[PDB]
Ligand SMILES: *CCCCCCOCCOCCNC(=O)c1ccc(C(=O)O)c(C2=C3C=C/C(=[NH+]\C)C=C3[Si](C)(C)c3cc(N)ccc32)c1
């Protein structure tokens with residue numbers, strides 16, 4: 251059984267003139283656990299992880315601006331927009347020290363925030379995260395042609411914005427098991443209108459692959475260097491074959507990053523939370539108890 255329900259009351263905070271939605275469960279005191287989704291998901295991707303953590307820790311899981319149940323202003327949705335909005339979210343809630351649980355573009359936000367606030371980060375659990383991809387040869391072959399098309403001027407927007415391919419095709423292709431129509435409807439909901447799909451297109455165009463965009467390569471290189479030197483507790487989840495993090499990369503990272511434990515979740519692509527949520531939540535819980 252992998253549940254499809256989303257049993258969390260909505261919470262809203264005004265951020266930069268916009269309303270961000272977030273899950274907020276678990277006890278009120280202690281160090282909070284901040285869950286950051288990426289593309290094209292929402293806090294829904296955490297729905298089956300949170301129940302393992304909420305017994306002992308506050309769980310905060312925002313919807314990135316432009317996604318989930320957060321407001322959808324008409325922005326460019328550059329990565330820097332997300333940085334600013336997430337910076338504002340974290341300050342609006344008065345968070346001081348945090349534990350990060352981060353995935354895909356949420357990992358770029360989390361690592362970049364950690365680099366800038368190293369004293370406030372007590373631990374980082376991460377999976378299928380943004381790292382530099384020097385050559386397309388490192389991108390999974392089955393996925394290469396479409397992601398190259400996503401990163402084109404016209405074809406890319408036709409696929410993602412007009413035809414909604416990132417939601418209808420790429421998202422299920424990021425899960426080994428078949429996503430159900432109930433799960434798919436939850437993921438479709440925020441993007442039923444083409445005009446709301448800009449974030450879905452800007453994100454693959456900011457992936458640091460083969461040196462571009464250079465400014466994002468730089469930012470990602472910066473926080474990977476910080477991660478290699480930081481003593482912060484680290485917990486890495488990976489699967490086979492993965493997408494961003496293939497098994498060989500995961501093994502390398504388990505040796506090169508300090509204080510890093512790596513967990514094999516079995517078959518997985520990008521949305522590892524959808525293929526083995528029970529292992530991922532139970533391991534985060536036991537890791538949290540030893541911090
Ligand atoms: C932060 C990183 C996030 C990583 C997410 C996972 O990424 C890896 C998966 O991407 C693999 C390739 N991506 C595709 O989007 C893809 C590949 C092939 C095809 C195809 O069948 O032609 C499509 C495609 C599909 C695929 C499945 C569908 N239903 C389950 C529906 C489609 Si439609 C009819 C919307 C479609 C239209 C067009 N014009 C091109 C391709 C597809 C997608």
Ligand SMILES: [Cl-]
Pocket residue numbers: 289453454455457
């Ligand atoms: Cl992406």
